[PDB]
Design a protein around this ligand. Structure first.
Ligand SMILES: O=C(CCNCc1ccc(-c2ccccc2)c(Cl)c1)NCCC(=O)Nc1cccc(C(=O)O)c1
Ligand SMILES: O=C(CCNCc1ccc(-c2ccccc2)c(Cl)c1)NCCC(=O)Nc1cccc(C(=O)O)c1
Lengths: 325, 324
């Protein structure tokens, strides 16, 4: 079978906490009356949720309301417990209330108000400094949630709220987040395709916080190279081929051999043979103002097949790429 | 009642954006308390417990104040004030804000402070020492007043003295508030013995001058070795203790000036009292701490009329401090 693995940091933080902290299945959820909130407009729609801008009628303050389709009560309890555990953490979306509409009985989460900057406009105006600044803000959120024994498992641009006018950032949608327990085998069907770590694609279940650092690297690559997404897979098998076209196939075999991973036969006629590419290959006239030797060295240290070889969020915060923030 | 406003730093908050003073909208962020290990208890209060602690990541001593979340509004107020005042002369420095993962109880992390043996401090402190530390408190008050904040709980328990390093900090900003001209404040602030007459007569439009009354109470207890100086047994009796020294004539002049309605519960306890000479409180055990300059300075702090008290900046110019 595959060789076991464990996080290099915050390995036993949940082991040493009482069960109430991490046993979300036993967590008792309480909610108030949604009659105190009026929905204003839709902000987003997903598979198991709809997010709205809303107003609390009792204090005239804007909030965000996430209405949850109750596909699994277990999943609702998990997201709520994680949000309650992380509440007030740096750049973590703040859960302000939990409510239920009296007639539909549909539960909803109420968050601090957030104001998303026009993304298409943001993507063209962000400078080299802005990218470093916001990447550092994401790292504060990741180091905090990892220190709190939680993996986000869905780091991607859609799950990062930037209010550029206020230089404010929040890491949002904790619906896929999970508690880290050393040796635990997790479901690999997490994260969104372009942001999936190679551990998920090769079906290595004993992953950890380092999965978030791979997804973060994917976001950094897309921002500095102006290539969205950076690894453009068309399916989950093709996603690994897109990564191998950059990192090369030699190091992919070194990774699967190190953890004694059995590579799915469906990869046999699509993976091919690929040399390790230089990150400088992705520099072009449209992105060269965002690229520097520090950015490429930092990117190289995130985008590694070996999950244990990636920088932790705390190590990443010490990188020279952030010396100006 | 007749409205009143501060003689100094009157509009400092009016002229600053809402983000500075609007604590209810202040977004609090905290780290993981897992990086701190508690060493010993330093004090216990109604809504907090203070510990000496160690940051395990750098092996540096700090102080950790664990807050009982009686009101989130009160927590936001103390945090915003501490963040606004951070680095101010003799103001306790807020170094971090954390939360214990399991209890979810928020805690404030301060620079390390080392309180000198208090029982030893009283008899060892000289006339110079009292002038030196009084001046250190005044630097902190002039700074926080200039920053549009009144402490509202000046008392010995809220002054940290590290005598070996001649270091002072004004601590526990849990009752502090932003000054806005014309605002009516809750009079149920400060500790009984340090309450200004404005609070005792229920005059809500008070200002930074409340801190100068409390400071005067501390000065009187130090130079005369009478702890506390105005020993009230309840909030009504507290005003009678002040009147036994300042006299009832000037108390009526004060309430008439601001058209204050005196609570009927004072009727059969206030009595009639002459204005006393400060020299009356001098004795063999305290005469080495008293001087004409000390009594003149004390007289200028302990006045009924909040507008007639020295400001922290005026107090720093007094001859009592010519040696510091
Ligand atoms: O789609 C979005 C976010 C969209 N962000 C776009 C975006 C994110 C990051 C960057 C960036 C990253 C690194 C460096 C520099 C820049 C950029 Cl350029 C754009 N939001 C709309 C929907 C929404 O706000 N949802 C929401 C809000 C609050 C809570 C929840 C929740 O599920 O808890 C959901
Ligand atoms: O009780 C105390 C302080 C106790 N000070 C006693 C004291 C204070 C003033 C003088 C003095 C006044 C005028 C002239 C000369 C001297 C003297 Cl003689 C003694 N501290 C123990 C607990 C503690 O340190 N609390 C603390 C520390 C840091 C921050 C906080 C906080 O709430 O932020 C609280």
């Amino acid at each position: 079978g595959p060789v076991p693995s464990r996080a290099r940091v915050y390995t036993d933080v949940n082991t040493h906490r009482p069960s109430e902290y991490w046993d979300y299945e036993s967590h008792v959820v309480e909610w108030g009356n949604q009659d105190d909130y009026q929905l204003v407009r839709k902000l987003g729609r997903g598979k198991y949720s709809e997010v709205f801008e809303a107003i609390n009628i009792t204090n005239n303050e804007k909030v965000v309301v996430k209405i949850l389709k109750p596909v699994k009560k277990k999943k609702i309890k998990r997201e709520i417990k994680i949000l309650e555990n992380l509440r007030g953490g740096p750049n973590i979306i703040t859960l302000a209330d939990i409510v239920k509409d009296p007639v539909s009985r549909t539960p909803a989460l109420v968050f601090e108000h957030v104001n998303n900057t026009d993304f298409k406009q943001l993507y063209q105006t962000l400078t080299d400094y802005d990218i470093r600044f916001y990447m550092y803000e994401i790292l504060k959120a990741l180091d905090y949630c990892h220190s709190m024994g939680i993996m986000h498992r869905d780091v991607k641009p859609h799950n990062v709220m930037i209010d550029h006018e206020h230089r404010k950032l929040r890491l949002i949608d904790w619906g896929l987040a999970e508690f880290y327990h050393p040796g635990q085998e997790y479901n690999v069907r997490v994260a969104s395709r372009y942001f999936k770590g190679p551990e998920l694609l090769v079906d290595y279940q004993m992953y950890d916080y380092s999965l978030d650092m791979w997804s973060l690297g994917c976001m950094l690559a897309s921002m500095i190279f102006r290539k969205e997404p950076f690894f453009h897979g068309h399916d989950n098998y093709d996603q690994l081929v897109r990564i191998a076209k950059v990192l090369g196939t030699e190091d992919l075999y070194d990774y699967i051999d190190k953890y004694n991973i059995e590579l799915d036969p469906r990869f046999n006629d699509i993976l091919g043979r690929h040399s390790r590419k230089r990150w400088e290959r992705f520099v072009h006239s449209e992105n060269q103002h965002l690229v520097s030797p520090e950015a490429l060295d930092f990117l190289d240290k995130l985008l590694r097949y070996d999950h244990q070889s990636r920088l932790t969020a705390r190590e990443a915060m010490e990188h020279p790429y952030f010396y100006t923030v």
